[PDB]
Design an enzyme around this catalytic site. Sequence first.
Site, PDB file in Angstrom:
ATOM      1  N   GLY A  47       0.769  -1.246   0.000  1.00 32.27           N
ATOM      2  CA  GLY A  47       0.000   0.000   0.000  1.00 32.27           C
ATOM      3  C   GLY A  47       0.797   1.292   0.000  1.00 32.27           C
ATOM      4  O   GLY A  47       2.020   1.291  -0.148  1.00 32.27           O
ATOM      5  N   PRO A 116       0.683  17.405   9.585  1.00 32.54           N
ATOM      6  CA  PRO A 116       1.654  17.974   8.636  1.00 32.54           C
ATOM      7  C   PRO A 116       3.116  18.008   9.115  1.00 32.54           C
ATOM      8  O   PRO A 116       4.019  18.158   8.286  1.00 32.54           O
ATOM      9  CB  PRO A 116       1.122  19.394   8.400  1.00 32.54           C
ATOM     10  CG  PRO A 116       0.321  19.725   9.615  1.00 32.54           C
ATOM     11  CD  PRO A 116      -0.022  18.458  10.343  1.00 32.54           C
ATOM     12  N   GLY A 117       3.345  17.843  10.420  1.00 30.34           N
ATOM     13  CA  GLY A 117       4.680  17.978  10.989  1.00 30.34           C
ATOM     14  C   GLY A 117       5.693  16.895  10.662  1.00 30.34           C
ATOM     15  O   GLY A 117       6.841  16.990  11.081  1.00 30.34           O
ATOM     16  N   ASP A 158       4.040  -2.206  16.896  1.00 33.36           N
ATOM     17  CA  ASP A 158       4.774  -1.525  15.819  1.00 33.36           C
ATOM     18  C   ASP A 158       5.238  -0.135  16.268  1.00 33.36           C
ATOM     19  O   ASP A 158       5.095   0.847  15.541  1.00 33.36           O
ATOM     20  CB  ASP A 158       3.902  -1.439  14.553  1.00 33.36           C
ATOM     21  CG  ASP A 158       4.710  -1.130  13.275  1.00 33.36           C
ATOM     22  OD1 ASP A 158       5.914  -1.474  13.187  1.00 33.36           O
ATOM     23  OD2 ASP A 158       4.115  -0.543  12.340  1.00 33.36           O
ATOM     24  N   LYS A 160       7.787   2.741  16.798  1.00 34.50           N
ATOM     25  CA  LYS A 160       9.023   3.253  16.204  1.00 34.50           C
ATOM     26  C   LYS A 160       8.831   4.736  15.831  1.00 34.50           C
ATOM     27  O   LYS A 160       7.695   5.159  15.574  1.00 34.50           O
ATOM     28  CB  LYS A 160       9.421   2.433  14.967  1.00 34.50           C
ATOM     29  CG  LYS A 160       8.280   2.184  13.993  1.00 34.50           C
ATOM     30  CD  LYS A 160       8.671   1.243  12.868  1.00 34.50           C
ATOM     31  CE  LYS A 160       7.604   1.252  11.790  1.00 34.50           C
ATOM     32  NZ  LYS A 160       7.816   0.199  10.767  1.00 34.50           N
ATOM     33  N   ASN A 163       6.478   5.755  12.942  1.00 33.10           N
ATOM     34  CA  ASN A 163       5.017   5.723  13.126  1.00 33.10           C
ATOM     35  C   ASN A 163       4.470   6.847  13.996  1.00 33.10           C
ATOM     36  O   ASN A 163       3.251   7.048  14.055  1.00 33.10           O
ATOM     37  CB  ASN A 163       4.582   4.387  13.745  1.00 33.10           C
ATOM     38  CG  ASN A 163       4.754   3.212  12.805  1.00 33.10           C
ATOM     39  OD1 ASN A 163       5.252   3.338  11.686  1.00 33.10           O
ATOM     40  ND2 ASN A 163       4.332   2.053  13.262  1.00 33.10           N
ATOM     41  N   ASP A 176      -0.731   4.041  11.983  1.00 37.25           N
ATOM     42  CA  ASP A 176      -0.324   2.693  11.597  1.00 37.25           C
ATOM     43  C   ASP A 176      -0.604   1.715  12.745  1.00 37.25           C
ATOM     44  O   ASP A 176       0.204   1.543  13.664  1.00 37.25           O
ATOM     45  CB  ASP A 176       1.144   2.646  11.130  1.00 37.25           C
ATOM     46  CG  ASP A 176       1.389   1.579  10.075  1.00 37.25           C
ATOM     47  OD1 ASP A 176       0.909   0.437  10.237  1.00 37.25           O
ATOM     48  OD2 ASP A 176       2.063   1.890   9.074  1.00 37.25           O
ATOM     49  N   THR A 193       9.464  -4.117  13.376  1.00 44.99           N
ATOM     50  CA  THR A 193      10.807  -3.753  12.929  1.00 44.99           C
ATOM     51  C   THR A 193      11.842  -4.473  13.821  1.00 44.99           C
ATOM     52  O   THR A 193      11.679  -4.493  15.039  1.00 44.99           O
ATOM     53  CB  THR A 193      10.981  -2.214  12.989  1.00 44.99           C
ATOM     54  OG1 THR A 193      10.073  -1.596  12.074  1.00 44.99           O
ATOM     55  CG2 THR A 193      12.398  -1.764  12.641  1.00 44.99           C
TER      56      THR A 193
END
Length: 342
Positions: A47, A116-117, A158, A160, A163, A176, A193
């Site tokens: 995706g 947006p950051g 997940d 990290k 994300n 995510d 990961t």
Amino acid sequence: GSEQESVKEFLAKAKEDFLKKWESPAQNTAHLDQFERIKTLGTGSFGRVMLVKHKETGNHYAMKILDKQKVVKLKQIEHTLNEKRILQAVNFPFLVKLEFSFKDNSNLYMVMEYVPGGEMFSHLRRIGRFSEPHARFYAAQIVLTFEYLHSLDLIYRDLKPENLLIDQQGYIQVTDFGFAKRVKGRTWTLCGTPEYLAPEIILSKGYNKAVDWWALGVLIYEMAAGYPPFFADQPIQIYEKIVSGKVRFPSHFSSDLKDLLRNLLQVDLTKRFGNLKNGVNDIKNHKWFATTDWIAIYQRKVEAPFIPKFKGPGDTSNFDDYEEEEIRVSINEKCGKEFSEF
Ligand SMILES: c1nc(N2CCNCC2)c2cc[nH]c2n1
């Protein structure tokens, strides 16, 4: 003291909201052709995520697009279905809001709040490393989020800096949930990961929500040092370092920090912080978090130690550039059976 009862009432009412939304999900609440394409914010195997504009309101959103056939190919059917189910059910300051989700012939769609950051990972690699008060501010939001998700029997799995994204108030927006899963007791899926995997995942004899607390340790270290604790050229070599447990802290790490990271990066999950009798409160009442006002972080009152650049709305200067590939709506409905309940 008296403030312990107030937070349990909150978490109870929070679970009631979750159960009611888990029970009665929202489904096909929008469609592609009311979203104007702007830019690819990210890509992946099965995706991509994109910046899109809703025409009726003018609002900007992040639209995760999954290829149905590719989701089946890599056996991500349950994972994908969970992500959407978990997103539309949950609600917390530091979790991204799923606004709309829908389905067409070839693809799945998840339209979420645009942040947006940019990713924390990009800011970390530019600045090199965060100071400890800066890392502690980000870590306190994760401790609260995990407390909230774990109380709902949801393992995230997940964690990290990739994300974790920064909103314009300088706070974290977790996105995510592709490996997130609701699970009482044990679960087995080998996912995440390699840098952030708890050793009990790698040994492949089941694991519990305590893998999230290990991942917190890996985060806090990576935020403070600028590199992760278990690093190698290949991932197989990263795994043999994790199971051994040996970690070399830098000189500049505090002894309060080190004591926390030894307690979070515990190989024996019997002795790991977050998975004891007090559970999360061993992390909250640790010396390193003595300066953190936990209520003030939840309410988003604490002044952020980093507030990113903002040119205008629909600006992507805090994101990397990828090749703008086409969205192919097929005539024939693919994989309808497998993603029926999406
Ligand atoms: C400490 N305090 C909290 N409250 C309870 C009610 N006052 C505002 C927020 C929460 C919520 C999740 N985790 C928390 N830790």
